[PDB]
Design a protein around this ligand. Structure first.
Ligand code: 28C
Ligand code: ZN
Length: 206
């Protein structure tokens, strides 16, 4: 049921998505170990992801959350990086898209920083890097991220499975690295919708 529609670089929608992508790159404490060394991306394609069934599943859950949270879904747009992107955009997020060993427990993790999600496209910790060159910093091979609609509802704040009782998600608030943005976790696949598929390369800095 999934269809991918390409946005053209002349569309303001393409342009706003690229800017969210470029504007939220930061340096990582691993010096680039997981995701590579880069300050910006070369965006090759932005596709909108259309799947009526996944969308209806997402909106259904969004409404239940909103009614449980003073009519506020607390919907954000956040990045997600995974070797399972192809499964996600055809079948939706599910338990098999859970980072079993994440900091906030087995769930589905998202980030405000595109460069954080970029660390996961090739696996936990960057795995062994691109399949062609086994290079976590590969400037050649094409990568893909999702920019997703995520329902947070009442989110539990954590300064640094199930949500804590009373809550629909966990917000991981950056607590030492002053430049980091927030990271979020949800525990039900229906609370996210993989709205844009972004194909890109990291760029070698000058
Ligand atoms: C911790 C984390 C994991 C992310 N993705 C994990 C994808 C994944 C990779 C391998 C695996 O066995 C399960 C999930 C992620 N994306 N954007 C931000 N994050 N943050
Ligand atoms: Zn490569």
């Amino acid at each position: 049921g999934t269809i991918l529609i390409d946005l053209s670089p002349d569309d303001k929608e393409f342009q706003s998505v690229e800017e969210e992508m470029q504007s939220t790159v930061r340096e990582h404490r691993d010096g680039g170990h997981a995701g590579g060394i880069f300050n910006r991306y070369n965006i090759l394609k932005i596709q909108k992801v259309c799947n009526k069934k996944l969308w209806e599943r997402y909106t259904h859950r969004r409404k239940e959350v909103s009614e449980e949270n003073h009519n506020h879904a607390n919907e954000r747009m956040l990045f997600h990086g995974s070797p399972f992107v192809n499964a996600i955009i055809h079948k939706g997020f599910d338990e098999r898209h859970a980072y079993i060993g994440g900091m906030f427990g087995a769930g589905i993790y998202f980030a405000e920083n595109s460069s954080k999600s970029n660390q996961y496209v090739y696996g936990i910790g960057g795995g062994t890097g691109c399949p062609v060159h086994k290079d976590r910093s590969c400037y050649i091979c094409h990568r893909q991220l999702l920019f997703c609609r995520v329902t947070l509802g009442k989110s539990f704040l954590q300064f640094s499975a199930h949500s804590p009782p009373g809550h629909h998600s966990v917000t991981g608030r950056p607590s030492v690295n002053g430049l980091a943005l927030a990271e979020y976790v949800i525990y039900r696949g229906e609370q996210a919708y993989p709205e844009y598929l972004i194909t890109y390369q990291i760029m070698r800095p000058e």
